[PDB]
Amino acid sequence: IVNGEEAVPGSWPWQVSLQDKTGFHFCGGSLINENWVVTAAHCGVTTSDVVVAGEFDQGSSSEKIQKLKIAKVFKNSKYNSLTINNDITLLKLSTAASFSQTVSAVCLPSASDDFAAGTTCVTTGWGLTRY
Amino acid sequence: TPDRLQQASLPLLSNTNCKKYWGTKIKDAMICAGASGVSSCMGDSGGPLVCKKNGAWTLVGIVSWGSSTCSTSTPGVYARVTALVNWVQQTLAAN
């Protein structure tokens, strides 16, 4: 996030970190329940990747983070890689996440929910702060 | 990539208005936000864009694509969750 600000540790408990086996963060993702995380299909997740929850500082070793393994990757069959349309994938954790103060779910909208232009929302993640 | 979790509030745009920046690449399953002096960037992909509705934070978008230099005056493109949620329901129910 460019021009963002540091968040309060654990104030976005559904935010997870997608990291490959080398410990490299490559994509964010959101916990929708204790066995399911939602991410972008373009992230190209595989079962060797790991889902990290309860994390705030990637450089800290004193955090009670949860390193969850992925049982199965569910790439939306409508995902169009040429246009990056319908960019959503569901990951089913083999290890069910334990919810707490810093680990919980975001709410999913009804297909009918309207989110008006002008409405202030928010976005999070550990992506570049400047290109 | 910064070590500690970042955040930024940003406004939603209509697809029509977004078309002015991105033309035909914007599909009905996409939802724009930003162009506000703030911008999602590489590494954020897959993350959330949430809006508060009735007290609760609701997943409205999934960080997807946008400006290659993450310019803060151009809108980032997110996956529109409303158009994908039915698929999500079907998948959870079946597995």
Partner: peptide
Amino acid sequence: CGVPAIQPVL
């Protein structure tokens, strides 16, 4: 869902 136990400050 959507209600963090640690409230975000913006």
